[model samples]
Target: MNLELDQDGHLVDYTIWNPEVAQELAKSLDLELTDWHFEVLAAVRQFYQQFGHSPATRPLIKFLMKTVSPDINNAVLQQKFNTGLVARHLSRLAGIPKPANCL
Candidate 1:
């Protein structure tokens, strides 16, 4: 599964995913879904849980850096976000769907 997003590029749902998918992705890509991934996903879930919605892609980018750490600039965050492994696999464990727009 993947980190699914809405038409507007906002995170939607991932109840369709399982831990095996997450582990496989992690092993192949050398990714650590610890504090960083958890923090971001948690923030996403919390935002939705509270507001009953997800933030747009633009704001989501900003929220990642600001919410995660002041040192996390867009460039660095972009690199992290660009890692296809994050979306293609780790998202499965995060309980988010694979992005429809992603190829």
Candidate 2:
């Protein structure tokens, strides 16, 4: 699918988002989505579903800690996303807007 993405690579239309779109987006960033990556992505999407917005770093890590792996932490998220801009980058790759709390 030819997606209409923002300059940051987030999909302009949320309806276009799915696992396939996210995988393609991740590939464009030189990332290969692993099982762990899908876990994080689902957590992010769940956060948005509950809160009406993508999560910031703290909340994302916290959610992952509770729901995914207890060992999940900021450092691990940073490592997985491959940047300190974990919230922004991951949200973008997941086809969601960068969280409002992110700068």
- Report the alpha-carbon TM-score of model 2 versus the true structure: 0.85
User: Best by lDDT, which number?
Assistant: 2
Residue pairs in collision within model 1: 2-97, 2-98, 4-97, 14-95, 14-96
Error of 1 at 27 (Å): 7.2
RMSD of 1: 5.9
What are the models' TM-scores? Answer: 0.47, 0.85
C-alpha RMSD in Å of predicted model 2 compared with the true structure? 1.7
Residue-level lDDT tens digits of model 1 in 1-103: 4555555332355454344544444454555555565566666555445555345555555665566666655455446544533433323334454434445
Instruction: List candidate 2 stretches off by more than 4 Å.
Output: none
Model 1, residue 9: C-alpha shift (Å): 13
